[PDB]
């Protein structure tokens, strides 16, 4: 006797923004509505119960309202730890249902990797890393990869202005790192692809004998 | 002077949803605020002016609001032609400014038939790519699946097809020996392996489902650029 | 074993006109002919299949015919939303082919803006963009230039006032761009000097109205690179 | 010419704890050591560089140390946002390497729910899930099972009432699943019969509080596949 339709299914905002998520109750309506937050890999956490009551310990920028059939969760000033999937729940005397969930996502120096995908062993693949906010000719750039569930593994680096290259032993003679200064883009040319190459591939900018700026990564699955 | 901050920068929604987009004026405020809709490849179109006046011909499901510095565009029930990017605009007596834009994208989609291509990108001649087409709302095991491509400013060109239950493949002469079509029923996904790419392969690649001796459902397409 | 020759490749018509598009099957023939509509930036949409069957949800003003090797798509009364490109498809048991397409386009009285002059230059180069207006007296309105870098948002560039040609510029183009207008020719211009890579964008010209921009041109692409 | 060995591979701690992570350079050694934090599904963030320099905007509770070959990251007082995986990095003039990583995990308050029994079955098979409760009397609360298919949303499965053991079921599992409890042993159960591919999911146990579900277990994975 209850049904909840949640909107939007995802949204991207910036830190400090005001975000609203709606759940429309299209059958029986009551105030027995709760909101949950779920971080990737973890169980849900209760935010609000009885449609508008703040759960003990939950920060005050979360609040809930009901107007007619519409229940709304408002995050008043979005914080970096707020990025998660949010669910509404409605309860009747006989049933419980959940809305479909809303993914809330983040977003100056910027790096964007592309090129990943599901690929066949033995073939070749080019990865790209598009830089903005800086001239990557003036920086060492790095590729670092991470197989699923495993650690960071440095793959290759290329030097500023002279394009000297450095490689991990594990990819030497198979991978070539390069860059197009005119396009402010760095590249990774992967040859003779194999199962160990399955990984998220990150591009990172050198600073301080370290890597201070990272892209979000592109997934390469070899199968 | 004026400055506008638009949020969210993007949202995904479904047909029937009520969607709200905010623009905060951080300086001078008047009700001289307008909203525009822009579709890909197209000029912007005016939706609302003077913060709440609907422009002639715009559907009544679009409304504009103001509360202090906060201006809002509301779509009361999202329709399939509403997926676009939206911009607010503020005018002063000496300056014009726009918000950064909000993209409204289609969600995915439930039990509705949907095709989503991916894998496009820029490659040098001789390079290779593998396109994927992820199906939702139906099992591609039961249907012929097609790839069709369109070079910029040119016509539709059939690329390849793959049959159900038997995996028989069919290719245009222009890609024989270079492209391979396949399907993975367990992932409900079709693929186009593209080897030995040349400049003339530059195009938007669409995946399409067979129905009625025709192609009844189509993806949004993925762009492939082959350039030296 | 199939081949489709589609005619015409383009045509100009008015709302309310009857429009017909033909595809001749030059090789084997069957009833397996379909017709599609495609609008700029969108995937094709199926209109008719098996030469004459109307696809669910398509308006009845669309119909498909066949006489011999010739298949025809008829739009009994063109509506504003029908301006688009149309394609026939033919299938055999071994092949699919598409006709080359027919663009159905609009032809007075209506407000129109048409930008031109875009092109590719090196940093430090220059271009003059022009915006030809019809349907209204450009001298009576504020005219604007707005640009959009690829993948990015709209950015106001410059405005010119009616009757007095007072000019207004965004800070990013001050001292480099000049807006002007020839009212006797109903054309606005954007002289773009000292170009830099960040000026790369589609440039639109827009008419002022209601404190906003009610009519825009289709834009002209400017690319600056070394 | 460089190699880092990181320990522990994982540790469990509470908010307010002092926590230390060690990386031993077993080959050439220098001050060129950095520390990174990474949260699930996100890129690493730089914390410390040159073994002891705090990157701009990193809280002062993070500090880095060196004793000979051993490099140590210390979090003086663990905060909720610090539960993450941490990595050390060493650079030479020719190579970069990373430690194997340290997962820093929350310990468990008094309330715990622990699901077990998840596993792999063929369509038509059966499983019994267990939910062990501690820190509260299960007899006095509604208990719920809620599941989540990979990359999808929460779906309520079943609930059982306190003191009278009334049961409630989702339509999608009616006639296949049975929820039960053993109050004397503080355990709830979900018997899952006649399984199908669509039942594949992480299954959570949850305690009723305030008309909602105030405590959740970490869930147990069920995979149904031919
Ligand atoms: Cl190499
Ligand atoms: Cl490939
Ligand atoms: Cl060929
Ligand atoms: Cl003809
Ligand atoms: Cl019909
Ligand atoms: Cl009609
Ligand atoms: Cl005007
Ligand atoms: Na010139
Ligand atoms: Na059932």
Author numbering:
A (entry chain C): 1 to 107, 113 to 215, 216A, 217 to 228
B (entry chain A): 1 to 107, 109 to 215, 216A, 217 to 229
C (entry chain B): 1 to 107, 111 to 215, 216A, 217 to 229
D (entry chain D): 1 to 108, 112 to 215, 216A, 217 to 229
Kindly provide excerpts from the paper associated with this entry:
Erythropoietin (EPO) initiates EPO receptor (EPOR) signaling in hematopoietic cells by binding to an asymmetric EPOR dimer through two different sites. Activation of erythropoiesis is dependent on an asymmetric dimer of the erythropoietin receptor (EPOR) formed by engagement of a single EPO molecule on erythroid cells. We engineered dimeric diabody‐Fc (Db‐Fc) fusion proteins that appeared to act as potent agonists of human EPOR in cell proliferation assays. Instead, a minor oligomeric form, identified as a putative tetrabody (Tb) fused to two Fc domains (Tb‐Fc2), proved to be the minimal active form.
To better understand the basis for VL–VH oligomerization and activity, we produced VL–VH 1.1 without an Fc domain. However, VL–VH 1.1 alone crystallized readily in space group P21 and we were able to solve the structure at 2.06 Å resolution with an R free of 21.2%. The asymmetric unit contained four VL–VH chains, and superposition revealed definitive linkages between the VL and VH domains (<15 Å apart) and showed that each presents a distinct conformation owing to the flexible linker. The 4 chains within the asymmetric unit form 2 Dbs (chains 1/2 and chains 3/4) held together by 2 conventional VL/VH interfaces in each, and the two Dbs pack with each other through unconventional VL/VL and VH/VH interfaces (between chains 2/3) to form a Tb with four antigen‐binding sites arranged asymmetrically ~59–68 Å apart. Thus, all four sites of the Tb appear to be capable of EPOR engagement. Furthermore, each Db forms non‐covalent dimers with the other Db in the Tb (i.e., chains 2/3 and chains 1/4) through unconventional VL/VL and VH/VH interfaces. Thus, the Tb quaternary structure is dominated by the light chain self‐association that combines the two Dbs into the Tb complex. The composite interface results in a combined total buried surface area of 759 Å2, but unlike the hydrophobic VL/VH interactions, the VL/VL and VH/VH interactions are largely mediated by polar contacts. Analysis of the VL/VL interface revealed an extensive and largely symmetric hydrogen bond network between β‐strand 1b of each light chain — including residues Ser9L, Ser10L, Leu11L, and Ser12L — and further supported by hydrogen bonds and van der Waals contacts made by Ala107L and Asp17L with Ser7L (Figure 9i(i)). Thus, the formation of the Db is dictated predominantly by hydrophobic interactions nearly identical to those involved in the highly favorable association of the 4D5 Fv, and this likely represents the first step in asymmetric Tb formation.
